[PDB]
């Protein structure tokens, strides 16, 4: 019937003066654009069909052609930026926003999806969707006493589209749009559907990826406990955005960071720092490095939760990028920590794996490790045990590594190594 039409036949049907012929041709276009292999998006664009599809969005008396054209345009807009731009350039944004209020749920849903693809292109189209007024009608679809009364797929698409309105930087979404969206988003973050939770978490991760004022807007809504609960979820697609969001929040102020600690986040990090997914381990170690850059009482809570042995483990064995985050966590710890916290780090076995990382062909980590070594030596100096540390570094083969760093191709690396071997190993 409408399966596997040629673009030429689609054009012929859409150019008829016959709404039903246009309907079958639009469905045939939709099916072409919905096939799994290589949808002919560019051929459909070059055929000049986008303006007609956009006009079909307005045919209230033929809801089927509204649906079919919304779907066709959704999938054109799923393509490259040039292809999305063709849909926008055809006037699709206001037509899709008007379909959000359609009495037909499948049509409103298709318009939700289309606007998500447009917004997902990047900041400009995101902001253009916002300027055309998409937020009010989108949130009105979710203004129900219980989200569970909405169709699962409808709710997931609404959540994914809202997430794209939260996504991307340079610029971040308009502050007023974020504030308008957040109460609904927090409600989605408590919904029981794993895909809704994942995309809600992603939205929160995007909103917290920025200056402390953006972080504060989110934290003020009280989402941190729910993020920490989701941080302990079994579904990796939920842990990943929940961890990203928690990680973003701890890049903010000590108060914002303390909110994460008080919600119980640190109790989940034994699992996160040993998580078999490398990206989780990395992001968790990155989050830890930003926590160990906090207050001494925050470092202390890291100690109290038993996480220093987990940092020693990551430093001892992990993907190199995770190990680099762990090196940063140690340098931050030793720069801000008390002497008692720093010695505790040594008793946990940090020296050997830290020295072993000096044999890496990466200059940044080398400088980070040398800074940590210096901080630990300064702590030992304050205790008079400087020599004992020197021995330990020598026994593990570290002295040789620092001596070799003298002959490195970086000034700070050479100068740092020379200063250590002169101040402590002479």
């Amino acid at each position: 019937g409408t399966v596997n039409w040629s673009v030429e036949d689609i054009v012929k049907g859409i150019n008829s003066n016959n709404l039903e012929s246009q309907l079958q041709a639009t469905q045939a276009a939709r099916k072409l654009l919905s096939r799994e292999k290589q949808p002919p998006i560019d051929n459909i664009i070059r055929a000049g069909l986008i303006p007609k599809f956009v006009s079909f969005l307005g045919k209230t008396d033929c809801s089927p052609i509204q649906f079919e054209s919304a779907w066709a345009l959704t999938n054109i807009a799923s393509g490259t930026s040039e292809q999305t731009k063709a849909v926008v350039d055809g006037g699709a944004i206001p037509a899709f926003i008007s379909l959000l209020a359609s009495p037909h749920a499948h049509i409103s849903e298709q318009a939700v999806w289309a606007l998500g693809n447009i917004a997902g292109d990047g900041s400009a189209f995101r902001d253009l969707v916002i300027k055309h007024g998409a937020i009010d009608p989108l949130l009105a679809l979710l203004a129900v006493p219980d989200l569970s009364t909405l169709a699962c797929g409808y709710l997931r698409n609404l959540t994914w589209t809202l997430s794209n309105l939260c996504r991307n930087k340079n610029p971040a979404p308009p502050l007023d749009a974020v504030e308008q969206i957040l109460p609904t988003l927090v409600r989605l973050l408590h919904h029981n559907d794993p895909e809704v939770l994942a995309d809600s978490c992603w939205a929160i991760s995007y909103l917290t990826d920025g200056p402390n004022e953006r972080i504060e807007m989110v934290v003020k809504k009280g989402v941190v406990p729910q993020l920490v609960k989701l941080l302990g979820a079994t579904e990796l697609p939920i842990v990943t955005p929940a961890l990203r969001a928690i990680g973003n929040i701890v890049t903010g102020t000590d108060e914002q960071t303390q909110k994460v600690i008080d919600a119980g986040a640190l109790a989940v990090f034994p699992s996160l720092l040993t998580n078999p997914k490398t990206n989780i381990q990395k992001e968790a170690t990155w989050t830890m490095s930003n926590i160990t850059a906090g207050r001494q009482d925050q470092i202390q809570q890291v100690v109290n939760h038993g996480l220093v042995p987990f940092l020693v483990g990551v430093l001892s064995k992990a993907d190199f990028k995770t190990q680099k985050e762990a090196a940063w966590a140690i340098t931050n710890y030793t720069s801000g920590g008390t002497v008692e916290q720093i010695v505790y780090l040594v008793h946990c076995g940090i020296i050997e794996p830290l020295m072993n990382l000096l044999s890496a062909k990466d200059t940044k980590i080398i400088q980070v490790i040398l800074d940590a070594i210096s901080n630990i030596f300064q702590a030992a100096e304050k205790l008079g045990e400087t020599e004992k540390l020197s021995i330990m570094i020598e026994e593990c083969g570290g002295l040789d590594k620092i001596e070799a760093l003298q002959r490195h191709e970086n000034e700070s690396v050479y100068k740092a190594s020379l200063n250590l071997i002169e101040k402590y190993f002479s």
Partner: peptide
């Protein structure tokens, strides 16, 4: 010292199958 930062294989945009 804080350091800041449905067809499948899809996150930014979604093609409806």
């Amino acid at each position: 010292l804080k350091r800041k930062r449905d067809k499948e294989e899809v996150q930014r945009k979604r093609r409806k199958a």
